[PDB]
Amino acid sequence: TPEVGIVTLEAQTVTLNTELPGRTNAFRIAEVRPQVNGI
Amino acid sequence: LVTEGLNAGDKIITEGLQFVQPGVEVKTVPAKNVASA
Amino acid sequence: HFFSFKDAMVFAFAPPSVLELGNATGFDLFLQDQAGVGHEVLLQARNKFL
């Protein structure tokens, strides 16, 4: 009888997370444009 | 993460992976290979 | 005692009588793929041979 080693695996609740890239943006951005012609 | 195929509470092997073939009677000893506890 | 490690098959062998012929004593042979039959059949040929 060849001796072996075992592990007794059991059920347990696991979570699954994902790493994703990405950039940040302004919530409410507004560049001004002059709407009129002068100096 | 085993999707489907392996039962809960069902023992698998860690030591002696070269020493056995399917169809050979073995003995069970708690393996000191897995680093968890 | 090396059969009680239960993880890795350990063989301890002495070097031969004259050292420059090899590293382990006894015969040795090659099993060629002369017909171009392939690795997936030469592997099971060696597993059949052992």
Instruction: Give CA–CA dist B14/B31, Å, rounded.
Output: 7
- State which residue of chain C sits closest to A2, comparing Cα positions: C6
H/E stretch holding C49: helix C39-49
Q: Resolution, rounded to a tenth of an Å?
A: 3.8
Instruction: Give CA–CA dist A25/B14, Å, rounded.
Output: 50
DSSP assignments along A1-39, one per residue: --EEEEEE------------------SS-------S---
Provide the number of CB pairs (under 8 Å) joining chain A to chain B. Answer: 61
The answer to whether B18 contacts C8, with C-beta atoms less than 8 Å apart, is: yes
User: How far is the alpha carbon of A12 from chain C, nearest alpha carbon, in Å?
Assistant: 28
Which of C1, C2, C6 should one mutate to test binding to chain A, selecting the residue with the greatest count of A CBs within 10 A? C6
Question: Is residue A9 within 8 Å of B37, Cβ to Cβ?
Answer: no
Q: Please name the residues in contact with C4: beta carbons below 8 A apart, sequence gap of 6 or more.
A: A3
Instruction: Give CA–CA dist B32/C2, Å, rounded.
Output: 16
Instruction: Give CA–CA dist B7/A11, Å, rounded.
Output: 9
Torsion angles phi and psi, residue C28, rounded to 5:
-160, 145
Nearest to B34 by CA among B17, B15, B11, B6: B15
Residue C1 per-residue DSSP state: -
